[PDB]
Amino acid sequence: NIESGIAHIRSTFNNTIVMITDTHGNALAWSSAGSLGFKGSRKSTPFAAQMAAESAAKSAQEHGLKTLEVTVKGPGSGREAAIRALQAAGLEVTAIKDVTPVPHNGCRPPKRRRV
RNA sequence: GAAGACUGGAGUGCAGAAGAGGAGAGUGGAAUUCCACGUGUAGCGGUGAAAUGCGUAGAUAUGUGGAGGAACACCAGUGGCG
Ligand SMILES: [Mg+2]
Ligand SMILES: [Mg+2]
Ligand SMILES: [Mg+2]
Ligand SMILES: [Mg+2]
Ligand SMILES: [Mg+2]
Ligand SMILES: [Mg+2]
Ligand SMILES: [Mg+2]
Ligand SMILES: [Mg+2]
Numbered sequence: 001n002i003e004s005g006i007a008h009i010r011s012t013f014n015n016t017i018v019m020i021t022d023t024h025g026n027a028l029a030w031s032s033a034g035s036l037g038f039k040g041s042r043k044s045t046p047f048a049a050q051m052a053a054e055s056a057a058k059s060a061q062e063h064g065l066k067t068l069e070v071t072v073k074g075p076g077s078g079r080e081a082a083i084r085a086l087q088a089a090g091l092e093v094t095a096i097k098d099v100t101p102v103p104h105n106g107c108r109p110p111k112r113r114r115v
Numbered sequence: 116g117a118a119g120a121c122u123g124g125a126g127u128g129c130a131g132a133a134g135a136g137g138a139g140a141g142u143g144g145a146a147u148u149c150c151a152c153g154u155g156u157a158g159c160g161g162u163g164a165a166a167u168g169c170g171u172a173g174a175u176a177u178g179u180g181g182a183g184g185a186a187c188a189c190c191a192g193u194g195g196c197g
Contacts, residue, residue, distance in 0.1 A: 008177070014161065017176065025178035027155040032175085034158055041164070103146035104188040 002064035007056075007086065011076030016049040018056040018082060020068075029059035049078030053085035061089070071097040 005028060008019035017032040033048035036055060042048060068091055072079055087093055 010176075015159080017159090019155095019176050021154080021177060025154075027177065030156070030176070032158075035156090041162080101146060102188065103186090104144070105186055106146045106188090107148090107185070 004067045005060070005065045006069040006071065008071050008073075009053075009079070009082050010073045011049065011078040011082065012074040013044060013076055015043045016052055016076060016078040016082060018053050020056050020060045028063055029056050031055040031059070044076065044078070046078050046081035049076075049082040050085045052078075053082040054089055057086050057089035057091065060091075065091075067092055067094055069095045069097065071099045073099050073101075075100075 003022065005020060005022050008017075008021065010017045010019075015033050017030065019030045020028045022028065031052045033043040033052050036048065036051045038048050068086060070083055070086070070093055072083075083093060083096065
């Protein structure tokens, strides 16, 4: 029940999700700006991410772990706010990874807005 | 108009070069979607704000595997070819 683990962060233009999992992708705890009581446009603010990271971090310590590897996805603004909340909860960030899925000119995207 | 002559036009020969020029056959890797199975809990998604929609019949997230189709990240350049 006590081990190491890795954290997945998905920061987009609407919401942020922090997923805390084992080395081989087995879920331990998660939280999101929606689950902290935010409803609409305020889901995406950096403050909402800072609470979301802390709530998952505290529930992570209950199982007991210290070292983390952080993977980052999405273009959201909560990348910086979320990671430093993990450190301020008493854990160590070993590495930072960017896993935004760039395609090699694959499927075409939805049309532009106001067209 | 007719009979001859020439090589600065035009074309052939000889030695090199570059190119996303065209048609046919086969193959590759990212990524999206769907399907099956682990972990897991209450939201996800979306907007100027919202709502319709999806989710406790267990979603979003995450790890593994399978199927299929379309376009070819960097190179890439008032660069190239017709
Ligand atoms: Mg859209
Ligand atoms: Mg000549
Ligand atoms: Mg060719
Ligand atoms: Mg061709
Ligand atoms: Mg693939
Ligand atoms: Mg209003
Ligand atoms: Mg899934
Ligand atoms: Mg020409």
